[PDB]
Amino acid sequence: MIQEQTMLNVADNSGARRVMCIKVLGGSHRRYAGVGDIIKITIKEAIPRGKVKKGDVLKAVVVRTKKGVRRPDGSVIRFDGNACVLLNNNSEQPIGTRIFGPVTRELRSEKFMKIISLAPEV
């Protein structure tokens, strides 16, 4: 459950550490983003030596949510924070080289193969 103005941590090592969600994509009047929905974010503070600077708008994908995800058998997965991965605004293509922390398997959409491969767990 990520909506506008929400703080997110960064799972990758692109140099960003905290980002603000400014829009939820994928539908008109969409309220909040799910486990693996694409969102538009702005970086609020990053590494000075990183390739992404403060106050830049680029897409992102949620990988972890505090609210959690629901499994088909009724189980749920919950995390202590919300995390995302950075993107390129033209092709999804996570720019990071490695991603820290667990990643749920809900991102297996025949496309996030790069995210799951770099995921230390699942």
Partner 1 sequence: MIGLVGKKVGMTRIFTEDGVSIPVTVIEVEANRVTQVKDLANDGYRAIQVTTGAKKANRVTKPEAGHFAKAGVEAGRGLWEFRLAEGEEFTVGQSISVELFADVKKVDVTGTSKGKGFAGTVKRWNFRTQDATHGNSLSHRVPGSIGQNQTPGKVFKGKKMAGQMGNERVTVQSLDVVRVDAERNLLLVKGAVPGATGSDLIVKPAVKA
Partner 2 sequence: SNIIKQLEQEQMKQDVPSFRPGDTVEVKVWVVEGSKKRLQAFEGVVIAIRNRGLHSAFTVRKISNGEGVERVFQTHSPVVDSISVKRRGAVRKAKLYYLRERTGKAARIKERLN
Partner RNA sequence: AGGACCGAACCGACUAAUGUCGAAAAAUUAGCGGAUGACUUGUGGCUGGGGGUGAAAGGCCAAUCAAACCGGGAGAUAGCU
Partner RNA sequence: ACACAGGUGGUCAGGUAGAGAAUACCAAGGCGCUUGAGAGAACUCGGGUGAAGGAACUAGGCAAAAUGGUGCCGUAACUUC
Partner RNA sequence: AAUUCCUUGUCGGGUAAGUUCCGACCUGCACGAAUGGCGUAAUGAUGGCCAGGCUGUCUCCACCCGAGACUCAGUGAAAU
Partner RNA sequence: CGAUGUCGGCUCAUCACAUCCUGGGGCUGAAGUAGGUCCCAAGGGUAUGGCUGUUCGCCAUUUAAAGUGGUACGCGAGCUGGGUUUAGAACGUCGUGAGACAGUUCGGUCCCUAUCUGCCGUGGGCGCUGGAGAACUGAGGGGGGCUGCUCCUAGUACGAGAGGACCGGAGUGGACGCAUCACUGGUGUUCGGGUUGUCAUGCCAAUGGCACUGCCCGGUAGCUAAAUGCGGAAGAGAUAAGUGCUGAAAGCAUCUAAGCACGAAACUUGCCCCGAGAUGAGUUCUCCCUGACCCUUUAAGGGUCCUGAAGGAACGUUGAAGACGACGACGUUGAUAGGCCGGGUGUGUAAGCGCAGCGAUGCGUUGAGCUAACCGGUACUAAUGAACCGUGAGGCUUAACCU
Candidates 31, 122, 118, 43; CA nearest to 79 is 122
Amino acid residing at 44: K
How big is the site for partner 2, counted in residues (CB under 8 A)?
Answer: 18
Q: Does 50 bind RNA (CB under 7 A)?
A: no
* Residue of the chain from 27, 48, 55, 74 that contacts partner 2 (CB under 8 A): 74
- Indicate which of partner 1, partner 2, RNA, none lies near residue 79 (CB less than 5 to 8 Å, by partner kind): partner 2
* Residue of the chain from 74, 76, 90, 91 that contacts partner 1 (CB under 8 A): 74
Q: Does 3 bind RNA (CB under 7 A)?
A: yes
DSSP secondary-structure letter at 91?
Answer: S
List of residues 6+ apart from 39 with CB closer than 8 A: 2, 21, 23, 24, 25, 33, 59, 60, 61, 62, 84
Q: How far apart are CA 76 and CA 64, in angstroms?
A: 12
* Residue of the chain from 5, 55, 73, 97 that contacts partner 2 (CB under 8 A): 73
Q: Does 67 bind RNA (CB under 7 A)?
A: yes
List of residues 6+ apart from 80 with CB closer than 8 A: 66
Residues of the shown chain interacting with RNA in the complex, contacts defined by CB under 7 A: 1-7, 20, 22-23, 25-32, 34, 40, 42, 44, 54-57, 59, 65-68, 70, 74, 76, 81-82, 89
